[PDB]
Amino acid sequence: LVSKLSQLQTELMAALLESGLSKEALIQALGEW
Amino acid sequence: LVSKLSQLQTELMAALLESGLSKEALIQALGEW
Numbered sequence: 001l002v003s004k005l006s007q008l009q010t011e012l013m014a015a016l017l018e019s020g021l022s023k024e025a026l027i028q029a030l031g032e033w
Numbered sequence: 034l035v036s037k038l039s040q041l042q043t044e045l046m047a048a049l050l051e052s053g054l055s056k057e058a059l060i061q062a063l064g065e066w
C-alpha cells in the first residue's frame with residue numbers, strides 16, 4: 001500500500017533525528033519553501 | 034576534519050529533499066524543539 005519511497009523517507013528522517021540532527025539543519029531545509 | 038557523521042547527515046538531508054521530501058515532514062521533525 002504505502003510506497004517504498006514514503007517508507008524510506010520516514011525511516012531516514014527518523015534515523016537522522018536520532019543521530020543528533022540539528023534544528024538548524026531542519027530550518028535550512030524548511031527554507032526551500 | 035569534518036566528521037563522517039556530519040558529512041553523512043548533510044548528504045542524507047540533501048538526497049531526501051531531492052527525492053521530494055515534504056515540508057510537512059520537516060515541520061513535524063522541527064517540532065521536536
